[PDB]
Design a protein around this ligand. Structure first.
Ligand code: U5P
Ligand code: U5P
Ligand code: PRO
Ligand code: PRO
Lengths: 257, 257
């Protein structure tokens, strides 16, 4: 029933992006995604280089990157290839299909040209996925659907979460998993990534709520933890990243028996 | 019960941004918002100048504007002041509060520095509004909550729509209305803006669905129509904008008796 990341990478129905990710997770013993919520390219690239060995994925946030250029992205790709992690852009695609197609491909950011993974809200209906899919690109790309949110008052519950799971099933040629607080699909080909993670209980003053790596990976059945401030605002960032990596990895191992 | 836009502009509980908008709608006899879904600054500014007299609002889409700069925004502000329309940015704010605060103020776009209006999805809970509010700015700014969507399979229905209305009520110092398909609040201080509008029946091939100005303003009780392709893809854009303006304006008048 429960399979290692390396075995999941070989599943018949696995998407190539998911397989690549699962293989590097197994190789590096990491199921940590760094949320690089920073405003300067210098710091983004410093984090990518210093923490690259500890992470399976780096979540970029280009809408707050004051000095974004595509040359910054090219240097991030070099680090991602060297250290072996995927690039996941934070942008909350959440529009009619015709608009998300334009937003994914175009503008200054040209997200599709560099992001291995993107995430979408399911509120618009399945056109949100179909519009992203319609971007022509001869590269391997995946999408994550936001099935649950970590924040107080989230409406991504109940039938909304179920709709996200059905939408993912039905678009598995492109959708490779979920942003969720827990396992929401029983199909092992899908990835579950969980934000709202810190070692200590608490939250922020703007509705964020935290749970621990052991809780979300071990008890709630998710695959990957997404951690921003727990690392990037820590006194010792590498020490923090390693604590999060070890916590999430052991919690995952505990489900393999 | 039903009040003109000019009378609504004087309501005791009206927000200053809503009042400014309602006054110019009455003065210019327009309840049309142009959706300027274009990739070049030249075209954005050509549309703003040519169609400015016909519109109450221009919805920018900076995430697809290949040559965005803040100098383009400054020139748009000049046109908005000259022709008398508000600037509404399309970005679908849809994140935890701590992130939307950063996204509204920062990055290359500095949206809060120029957008009179923004819109947010309610799925994260009320932190999505509280985070936008927390941006310090000594200017008049408002937010619209996405209570319904026009696209096939939209999940913004039922209890989700009701949650959006409650969130708006409860944050009326900043939330000035809704993106919706119909009137969703009975409070006349709130603005209802409806996308998914074309003169003819139909849709697109990515889940957009259209209703007419008469249907959405006259029968469904909305205030403003948001029109993109019906104008910007028309053979004669000014002719189209005037047809949409006249349609929406008459439909509104029909409810005043
Ligand atoms: O439900 C969600 C979806 C996404 N994120 C993202 O994960 C990161 C959490 O950062 P932090 O609270 O660990 O600093 C942020 O970038 C935020 O967008 C959440 O926190 N919750
Ligand atoms: O429920 C919604 C919310 C927003 N819009 C926006 O309104 C415009 C509709 O354009 P068009 O279909 O009139 O070209 C697009 O920019 C889209 O983001 C919708 O169509 N539906
Ligand atoms: O579906 C695909 O594979 C391509 C890649 C980006 C979106 N379209
Ligand atoms: O609430 C307000 O009025 C200011 C303006 C932008 C967000 N904060």
């Amino acid at each position: 029933m429960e399979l290692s990341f390396g075995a999941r990478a070989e599943l018949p129905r696995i998407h190539p992006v998911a397989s690549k990710l699962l293989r590097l997770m197994q190789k590096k013993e990491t199921n940590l995604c760094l949320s690089a919520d920073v405003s300067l390219a210098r710091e983004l690239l410093q984090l990518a280089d210093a923490l690259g060995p500890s992470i399976c994925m780096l979540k970029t946030h280009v809408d707050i990157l004051n000095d974004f250029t595509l040359d910054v992205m090219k240097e991030l790709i070099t680090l991602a290839k060297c250290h072996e992690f995927l690039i996941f852009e934070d942008r909350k695609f959440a529009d009619i299909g015709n608009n998300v197609k334009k937003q994914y491909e175009g503008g200054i950011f040209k997200i599709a040209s560099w992001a291995d993974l993107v995430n979408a809200h399911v509120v618009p209906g399945s056109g949100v996925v179909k519009g992203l899919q319609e971007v022509g690109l001869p590269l391997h790309r995946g999408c994550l659907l936001i099935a649950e949110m970590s924040s107080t008052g989230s409406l991504a519950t109940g039938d909304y979460t179920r709709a996200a799971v059905r939408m993912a099933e039905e678009h598995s040629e492109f959708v490779v998993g979920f942003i969720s607080g827990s396992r929401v699909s029983m199909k092992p080909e899908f990835l579950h990534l969980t934000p709202g993670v810190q070692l200590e209980a608490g939250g922020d003053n703007l509705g964020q709520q935290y749970n621990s790596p052991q809780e979300v990976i071990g008890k709630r059945g998710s695959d990957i933890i997404i951690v921003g401030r727990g690392i990037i605002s820590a006194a010792d960032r590498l020490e923090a990243a390693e604590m999060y990596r070890k916590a999430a990895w052991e919690a995952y191992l505990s489900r393999l028996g």
